[PDB]
Design an enzyme around this catalytic site. Structure first.
Site, mmCIF file in Angstrom:
data_model
loop_
_atom_site.group_PDB
_atom_site.id
_atom_site.type_symbol
_atom_site.label_atom_id
_atom_site.label_comp_id
_atom_site.label_asym_id
_atom_site.label_seq_id
_atom_site.Cartn_x
_atom_site.Cartn_y
_atom_site.Cartn_z
ATOM 1 N N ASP A 175 5.649 36.687 48.940
ATOM 2 C CA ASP A 175 5.796 37.728 49.834
ATOM 3 C C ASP A 175 5.577 37.158 51.372
ATOM 4 O OD1 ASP A 175 5.779 40.066 51.145
ATOM 5 O OD2 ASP A 175 3.590 40.543 50.741
ATOM 6 N N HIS A 222 27.836 75.601 58.326
ATOM 7 C CA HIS A 222 26.838 74.591 58.267
ATOM 8 C C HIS A 222 26.795 73.824 56.781
ATOM 9 C CE1 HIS A 222 22.725 72.554 58.453
ATOM 10 N NE2 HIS A 222 23.206 72.384 59.657
ATOM 11 N N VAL A 267 39.678 45.339 42.226
ATOM 12 C CA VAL A 267 39.955 45.859 40.745
ATOM 13 C C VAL A 267 40.561 47.269 40.976
ATOM 14 C CG1 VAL A 267 38.554 44.319 39.292
ATOM 15 C CG2 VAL A 267 37.536 46.415 40.572
ATOM 16 N N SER A 324 41.414 50.784 40.412
ATOM 17 C CA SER A 324 40.894 52.057 39.893
ATOM 18 C C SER A 324 39.922 51.514 38.604
ATOM 19 C CB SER A 324 41.770 52.938 39.314
ATOM 20 O OG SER A 324 42.763 53.353 40.401
HETATM 21 N N1 LIG Z 1 34.235 60.688 45.787
HETATM 22 C C1 LIG Z 1 34.004 59.165 45.629
HETATM 23 C C2 LIG Z 1 35.320 58.272 45.753
HETATM 24 C C3 LIG Z 1 35.464 57.078 45.330
HETATM 25 N N2 LIG Z 1 34.057 56.305 45.067
HETATM 26 C C4 LIG Z 1 34.044 54.837 44.843
HETATM 27 C C5 LIG Z 1 34.933 54.552 43.749
HETATM 28 C C6 LIG Z 1 35.934 53.294 44.188
HETATM 29 O O1 LIG Z 1 35.786 52.176 43.017
HETATM 30 C C7 LIG Z 1 35.372 52.825 45.202
HETATM 31 C C8 LIG Z 1 36.556 52.510 46.171
HETATM 32 O O2 LIG Z 1 37.357 53.480 46.494
HETATM 33 P P1 LIG Z 1 38.949 53.292 47.253
HETATM 34 O O3 LIG Z 1 39.612 54.389 47.149
HETATM 35 O O4 LIG Z 1 38.702 52.529 48.446
HETATM 36 O O5 LIG Z 1 39.509 52.268 45.761
HETATM 37 P P2 LIG Z 1 40.979 52.908 44.951
HETATM 38 O O6 LIG Z 1 41.388 51.724 44.204
HETATM 39 O O7 LIG Z 1 40.232 53.768 43.820
HETATM 40 O O8 LIG Z 1 42.095 53.648 45.752
HETATM 41 P P3 LIG Z 1 43.472 54.125 45.080
HETATM 42 O O9 LIG Z 1 43.342 54.501 43.733
HETATM 43 O O10 LIG Z 1 44.145 55.050 46.162
HETATM 44 O O11 LIG Z 1 44.480 52.829 45.063
HETATM 45 O O12 LIG Z 1 34.575 54.047 46.063
HETATM 46 C C9 LIG Z 1 32.773 56.911 44.887
HETATM 47 O O13 LIG Z 1 31.899 56.463 44.763
HETATM 48 N N3 LIG Z 1 32.908 58.634 45.201
HETATM 49 CA CA LIG Z 2 8.524 41.427 49.754
HETATM 50 CA CA LIG Z 3 39.574 50.672 44.272
#
Ligand SMILES: Nc1ccn([C@H]2C[C@H](O)[C@@H](COP(=O)(O)OP(=O)(O)OP(=O)(O)O)O2)c(=O)n1
Ligand SMILES: [Ca+2]
Ligand SMILES: [Ca+2]
Lengths: 347, 942, 347
Positions: free
Chosen positions: B132, B525, B662, B664
DNA sequence: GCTCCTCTAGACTCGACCGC
DNA sequence: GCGGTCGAGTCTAGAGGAGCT
């Protein structure tokens, strides 16, 4: 279009309507600037000189002649002349870098036409050349935006020269398109080395404890095109020029005619003693509706329209109309000078 | 023939690689499963559509240890975590000598052996350390003092800025002042304690990993946001006895119990100056030691418990690796901060000047009483106060003087009329009522010309700018907050009627306000109709004003230029404090490696630092990392001030940043779970089929199809679908559709949400798999077997908070994916001597700071790790195969800075020129698998 | 003689010391002024403005382009073109005047000289009266700043056309040199430039209309600078505060350097923001002898010298010296600006 | 399926001196 | 003696965090 009629009737720039073309004004050859345009250019020069030379401990004025002998043709750029005085002005700064020169003059641009020039030939050690250039761009763009009503029209563009030297150009988004109004070029040592052959130990500046050849930098600014830019930016017909730039501050009209004339003359002397330039409005021989007279004043960009009425002989209260507001106030004639200097001194 | 095809015609893995991973032979596909998958696919019309096969790939994968892929990972994780679990076990059992009654005052480390005797040392010289470190926040960010314990003795550290009183020390940091120090460092929220260690910031990795007791706590007995709020408000309710908040005192009470932890009441480290901390040294040191012992007890009670809830060693071997995030910056960071702050100030000044001009140009309506016709400024005060009271020839030399003095004395005698003036001067009585308030008093020493007291938050700024919501003039009332009037001093309803013609269902036709000729619909709101908005400039309305619904109405230049300035500075206002306070330690050139100091891109005048994010390796019940500054969804938008911060993370010369995103990952994880549950082959679920064979270019994927179906923007449909996968109910979709489209009413939104959630469907066998793995008596991740939080198990919280757990399944599966990626990448880097290290794991992205000569080998390693991770997912889910399309990265980025694409120029109002023009950053390379193999010859080894 | 050494060494003029030719100075073909000389010329021009165009009601600023492949002979011809234009600035009420500060061209083949030309479109009846009026006022103005107003002299001369003219002079040590000239040219130039068309040539002078007889008053500001410089000249250049380029100098005594530098910076900013020109003498790391420092400041016509020492940290009292009386005195910080303003205004 | 704290700014109010 | 500002005081609304400093 409509602006050049206003800029002509109010004597910002004189001459016949045929002469007032955009090409003529931009080229540098035009008939001339009228008294109000002259005063606007003087105010712009004063503000530039303040913000550049006054509040700096290492900026000095310089003098460049309108002629350039040898290889006989008149002058075209002031930077080429300011470089000649560099070794002379090092004695004032005890060779302390950074330091620069300044000058406001008339340079003739072949098309023959001339442009009111402003120069800030500025010398930096090569170590901080990029940082000083970036700071000066960030400062000059802010300065141009400071007095402007619409800063977004003023812009900045980065550019590289034929040698790739980093430089920046400023523009005003005129109605017809962008036009160059300032150029910050990191010329390096090329110009000074060419102008001063032989041993280069004469040019050395005290960069801290290191003697190094300076890296010049020119902030050339066209004050005629800048003034035209402000006249286009300011534009019920009004010209919302910055209170530190308006050519005439107060239109001291007059509302017993002899006593009021004496009071107006006294107040006219009073204001002029403090630098607040006045426009005598007690000399006309044509009665006019106050609305017409006001719309005549607004085109001139008059900050205030004092009216020394008959009642001021009793209680000393004078009408005061402000351009921007459009609302009139009754302020005691003893407190007039303080209010005006306070209003135009905030900057 | 390298080409292979599963009975669903999806191009599976190439035969040259499938044999090297899943072995030869395999298993025959079941006829019943194939028939069910075919019927399911042709039910949705996706069956029969052909896709051109991808060019098959041949590679020589490195030898796989163990009998299969799962045993291979396990072996990798064991061989990675053994030297640190040895230290952890050495620290769990220890006979620690009694605490020193009085602490030493010397610099550096001191050793307190048996019975409090003081001995000076240079390093803790111990593998394990509960650690710490305390900082004097008022003075700066340099660590003040630190107390550490090892299984043999006690240690303490006092910095030079506390031992020695001297002149002001350099504001810019350096490794010369931080804490000197296989090793393991245990602490609570150790990310804070991590950033103060000298050897961390060196580019070459020093083999030391940090265990955070808060990360273990959030993995073991964490709480969701709703559960945390309920627990805090109060303190189907048994989870309070088993869970707690992240505070060290609360965690210690939960896992140890007994006396409450000692908390400093004066808070000298946070508020007091350096003198106070100097004077109270013997008390603050004991407080720090008590905190250290509390962390040690919690670690003792957690570590044996932690390893029985995350049995797979990959999870721990990744959590150790996710805690060494390293963001290298250069001298462009300071210039970025300056430029951003200066531009923000200039834009604020321009907006203020535009507001002042709008105020000045509005006083003219007083003349002629036209202000009664203005839709916005009618309600203001416009009355005025009265100023109550209590040629002739040249003149000769003497004539000029006598005339001048006559005029002077005629003026001078008017000074006597000061009696009639009231002693207390009036304040601008000729100006309208509303204009007097904005003007500072002439008596005030801080007077500024014009309406200087005008600002966005006032009740009059949304009136000067003539703000229009859907073309309707805004309007404020005390009892209902800000709202807008829909047409159809008397309010000029005629002007409002005329205005809307040039340019309805809302938040309620409030008739308790009674603005004549209009209905006062409130603003929606973010907390529902029950609340009332106090400012139409709130951060919640930025999408609305960027959508064109909230405009500045009548064009007058100033109106909009303001609104656009407010939109532009909408980001830096919220994050300037955080971004400007990031701890950057500028490495001296004497500590830089020979690769950087001898490279053509190296600058002898530049400074290269290293921002080490204070990441929480387990920041939620779902164990995903949490860091608000960096790990967020952001990009260099064209009209956002200071949004290019991620582009400022530039690799040092001689080094490059080989990272990849990666594609989707969460969707595909859902798809693979669904297909593993339904029929045991990829694409047997329509959702999986659209995830595999869908085309973003052709608009076949789920996002584009949903956007076409419900007629919304793809950016809205993305959030919509990600929420739908996360178990959000119909009401959530109704709220989303209402927020995205104001014209849609409650009935239409409900119908559309229900129809979209009605799609057995295209994803039913995925939701059933998610629920069946969250309603089980011990919800465990389907890949690595990590357990759920004890505040969520169905035994404790039955019947409630299901949505949190169904989201947790997917998110923790993604975290397991990330841990597998990290372990595999570290193994590849160590075995083939690929000189590189982990950089950051922003959301799904994975970046590695690799040496310049090994950018291509790093890309091939990243592709191999992605292939292996997907194969491991299929193996654990029981598929023993992998489709070719998702078998590699779409494109592995090789660029000099963090950036969502290698083509973005990052044009923002902060840097209108772009990255290359000023910073000198060239564009990067996006390499698919085939180019990587061509450049690398297919072999990782040199 | 030795004055020219002072001007160049103290940066009033520009160029090498070997090229300081008197004829070049008096003919407009000198290399140019230095920074302090440029500011002295600006002070003169500002005082000429305040005395001729500011405190008047019918005098206005104009400017004309240098060219017209050869340039302008005199500034007069621009005013003759503005005659039609400026006949609306005063509402056609004859008489009216135009004044300008601009460069006239004298082939010594090219030369540059800035002239304070004043033209007055007086009616034929009062031409002689207004000529005498302008003559008396110009003599008063040229004698006001002079330490010895007896050296300035006037004369009356007749031209070939029978038009009386007055010529002003300064008694330079070598002899009498012209510095100003006056002419009652008449209506010949205006009629020649505008043959016929009597509607434009006549303005409302009284109830009737008339063609004015112009009066030319032309004084060389560039030569007025030399006249006033020779007026001033132990070594000392005493000058009126309205003309001296830089007025007060700041210094630093013994250590500690940091706080002394901070207080000097604050004092420098305070003095500047109130319009007092200050020589930043505190930036130099090495402070030389007080005697030579004060001599250097005296050679720049610096009115006051400020020496801020370690005593200012103890009680605040500073050392203030006036060049005229060479007597030191003590004063607190808050009174120095007020004293400087009072001394500038009172003279 | 959705709140706790602190901290800051804008707005309306009542009670109080003071100048007429 | 009586109205005109002027200064606490509270209420409301928003904004930062849900660690550790
Ligand atoms: N309502 C949401 C939308 C997305 N994400 C998260 C999941 C993704 O893994 C990450 C990144 O989103 P991106 O759109 O930038 O990446 P993608 O590859 O999914 O976009 P696309 O499918 O259009 O190529 O954000 C989240 O937590 N809540
Ligand atoms: Ca600490
Ligand atoms: Ca992504």
């Amino acid at each position: 279009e409509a602006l050049l009629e206003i800029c002509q009737r109010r004597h910002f720039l004189s001459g016949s309507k045929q002469q007032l073309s955009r090409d003529s004004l931009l080229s540098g050859c035009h008939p001339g600037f009228g008294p109000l345009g002259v005063e606007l250019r003087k105010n712009l020069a004063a503000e530039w000189w303040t913000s550049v030379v006054v509040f700096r401990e290492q900026v000095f004025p310089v003098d460049a002649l309108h002629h350039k002998p040898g290889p006989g043709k008149l002058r075209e750029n002031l930077l080429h002349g300011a470089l000649e005085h560099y070794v002379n002005c090092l004695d004032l700064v005890n060779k302390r870098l950074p330091y620069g020169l300044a000058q406001i003059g008339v340079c003739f641009h072949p098309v023959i036409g001339e442009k009111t020039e402003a120069s800030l030939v500025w010398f930096t050690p090569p170590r901080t050349s990029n940082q000083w250039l970036d700071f000066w761009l960030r400062h000059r763009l802010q300065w141009w935006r400071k007095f402007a009503m619409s800063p977004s029209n003023f812009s900045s563009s980065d550019c590289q020269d034929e040698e790739g030297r980093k430089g920046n150009k400023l523009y005003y988004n005129f109605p017809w398109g962008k036009e160059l109004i300032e150029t910050l070029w990191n010329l390096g040592d090329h110009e000074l080395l060419h102008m001063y052959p032989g041993n280069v130990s004469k040019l050395h500046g005290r960069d801290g404890r290191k003697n190094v050849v300076p890296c010049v930098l020119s902030v050339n600014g066209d004050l005629d095109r800048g003034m035209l830019a402000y006249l286009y930016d300011s534009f019920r017909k009004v010209l919302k020029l910055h209170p530190c730039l308006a050519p005439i501050k107060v239109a001291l009209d007059v509302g017993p005619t002899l006593e009021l004339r004496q009071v107006c003359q006294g107040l006219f002397n009073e204001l002029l003693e403090n630098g607040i330039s006045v426009w005598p409005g007690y000399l006309e021989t044509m009665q006019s509706s106050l609305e017409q007279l006001y719309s005549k004043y607004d085109e001139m960009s008059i900050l205030f329209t004092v009216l020394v009425t008959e009642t001021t002989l009793e209680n000393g209260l004078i009408h005061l109309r402000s351009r921007d507001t459009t609302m009139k106030e009754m302020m005691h004639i003893s407190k007039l000078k303080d209010f005006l200097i306070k209003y135009i001194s905030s900057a | 023939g390298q080409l292979r095809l599963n009975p669903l015609l999806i191009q599976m893995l190439s035969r040259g690689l499938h044999e090297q991973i899943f072995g030869c032979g395999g298993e025959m596909p079941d006829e019943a499963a194939v028939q069910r998958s075919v019927e399911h696919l042709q039910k949705h019309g996706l069956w029969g559509q052909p896709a051109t096969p991808l060019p098959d790939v041949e590679l020589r994968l490195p030898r796989l240890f163990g009998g299969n892929l799962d045993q291979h990972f396990r072996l990798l994780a064991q061989k990675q975590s053994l030297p640190y679990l040895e230290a952890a076990a050495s620290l769990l059992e220890a006979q620690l000598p009694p605490e020193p009654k009085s602490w030493a005052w010397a610099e550096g480390w001191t050793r307190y052996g048996p019975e409090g005797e003081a001995e000076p040392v240079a390093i803790p010289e111990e593998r394990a350390l509960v650690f710490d470190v305390e900082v004097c926040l008022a003075e700066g960010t340099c660590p003040t003092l630190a107390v550490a314990i090892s299984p043999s003795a006690w240690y303490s550290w006092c910095s030079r800025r506390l031992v020695e009183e001297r002149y002001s020390w350099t504001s810019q940091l350096s490794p010369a002042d931080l804490i000197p120090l296989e090793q393991l460092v245990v602490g609570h929220n150790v990310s804070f304690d991590r950033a103060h260690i000298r050897e961390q910031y060196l580019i070459q990795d020093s083999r030391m990993r940090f265990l955070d007791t808060m990360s273990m706590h959030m993995a073991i007995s964490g709480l969701s946001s709703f559960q945390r709020s309920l627990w805090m408000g109060a303190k189907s309710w048994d989870w309070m006895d088993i869970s707690s908040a992240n505070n060290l005192a609360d965690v210690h009470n939960l896992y140890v119990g007994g006396p409450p932890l000692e908390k400093e009441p004066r808070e000298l480290f946070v508020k007091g100056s350096m003198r106070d901390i100097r004077e109270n040294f013997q008390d603050l040191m004991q407080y720090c030691a008590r905190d250290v012992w509390a962390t040690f007890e919690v670690f003792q009670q957690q570590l044996p418990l932690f390893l029985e809830r995350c049995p797979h060693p990959v999870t721990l071997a990744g959590m150790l690796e996710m805690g060494v995030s390293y963001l290298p910056v250069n001298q462009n960071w300071e210039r970025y901060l300056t430029e951003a702050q200066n531009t923000y100030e200039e834009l604020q000044r321009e907006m203020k000047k535009s507001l002042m001009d709008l105020a000045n140009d509005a006083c003219q309506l007083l003349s002629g009483e036209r202000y009664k016709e203005d839709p916005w400024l009618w309600d203001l005060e416009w009355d005025l106060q009265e100023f109550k009271q209590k040629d002739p020839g040249p003149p000769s030399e003497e004539e000029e003087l006598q005339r001048s003095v006559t005029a002077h004395n005629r003026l001078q005698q008017l000074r006597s009329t000061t009696d009639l003036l009231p002693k207390r001067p009036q304040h601008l009585p000729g100006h309208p009522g509303w204009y007097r308030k904005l003007c500072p008093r002439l008596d005030d020493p801080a007077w500024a010309p014009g309406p200087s007291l005008l600002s966005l938050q006032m009740r009059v700024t949304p009136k000067l700018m003539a703000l229009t919501w859907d073309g309707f003039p805004l309007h404020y009332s005390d009892s209902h907050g800000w709202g807008y009037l829909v047409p159809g001093v008397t309010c000029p309803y005629r002007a409002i009627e005329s205005l809307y013609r040039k340019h309805h269902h809302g938040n309620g036709p409030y008739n308790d306000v009674n603005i004549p000729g209009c209905w006062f619909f409130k603003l929606p709101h973010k907390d529902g109709n029950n609340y009332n908005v106090g400012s139409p400039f709130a951060k919640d309305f930025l999408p609305k004003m960027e959508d064109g619904t909230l405009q500045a109405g009548p064009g007058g230049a100033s109106g909009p230029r303001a609104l656009e300035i407010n939109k532009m500075i909408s980001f830096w206002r919220n994050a300037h404090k955080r971004i400007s306070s990031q701890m950057v330690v500028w490495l001296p050139r004497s500590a830089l490696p020979r690769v950087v100091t001898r490279h053509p891109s190296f600058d002898e005048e530049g400074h290269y630092g290293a921002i080490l994010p204070q990441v929480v390796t387990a920041g939620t019940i779902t164990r995903r990392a949490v860091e608000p500054t960096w790990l967020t969804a952001s990009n260099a938008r064209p009209d956002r001030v200071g949004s290019e911060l991620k582009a400022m993370v530039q690799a040092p010369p001689g080094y490059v940043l080989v990272g990849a995103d990666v594609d989707s990952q969460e969707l595909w994880i859902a798809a693979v779970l669904g297909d593993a549950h339904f029929a045991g082959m990829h694409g047997c679920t329509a959702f999986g089929w659209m995830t595999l064979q869908g085309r973003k270019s052709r608009g076949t994927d789920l996002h584009s199809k949903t956007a076409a179906t419900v007629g919304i923007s793809r950016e809205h449909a993305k959030i919509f679908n990600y929420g739908r996968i996360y178990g959000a109910g119909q009401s959530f979709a109704e709220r989303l559709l209402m927020q995205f489209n104001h014209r849609l009413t409650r009935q239409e939104a409900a119908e559309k949400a229900q129809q979209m959630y009605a799609v057995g469907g295209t994803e039913s066998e995925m939701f059933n798999k998610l629920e069946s793995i969250a309603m089980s008596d011990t919800p465990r991740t389907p890949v690595l077997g990590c357990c759920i939080s004890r505040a969520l198990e169905p035994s404790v919280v039955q019947g409630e908070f299901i949505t949190s757990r169904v989201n947790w399944v997917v998110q923790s599966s993604a975290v397991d994916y990330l841990h597998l990626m990290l372990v595999a990448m570290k193994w590849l880097f160590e075995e083939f001597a690929i000189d590189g290290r982990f950089c950051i794991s922003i959301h799904d992205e994975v970046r590695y700071l690799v040496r310049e000569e090994d950018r291509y080998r790093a890309a091939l390693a990243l592709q191999i790790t992605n292939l292996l991770t997907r194969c491991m997912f299929a193996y654990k889910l029981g598929l023993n195969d992998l489709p070719q399309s998702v078998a590699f990265f779409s494109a592995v980025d090789i660029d000099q800075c963090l950036r969502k694409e290698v083509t973005m120029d990052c044009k923002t109002p902060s840097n209108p020129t772009g990255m290359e023009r000023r910073y000198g950053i060239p564009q990067g390379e996006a390499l698919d698998i085939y180019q990587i193999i061509e450049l690398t010859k297919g072999s990782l080894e040199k």
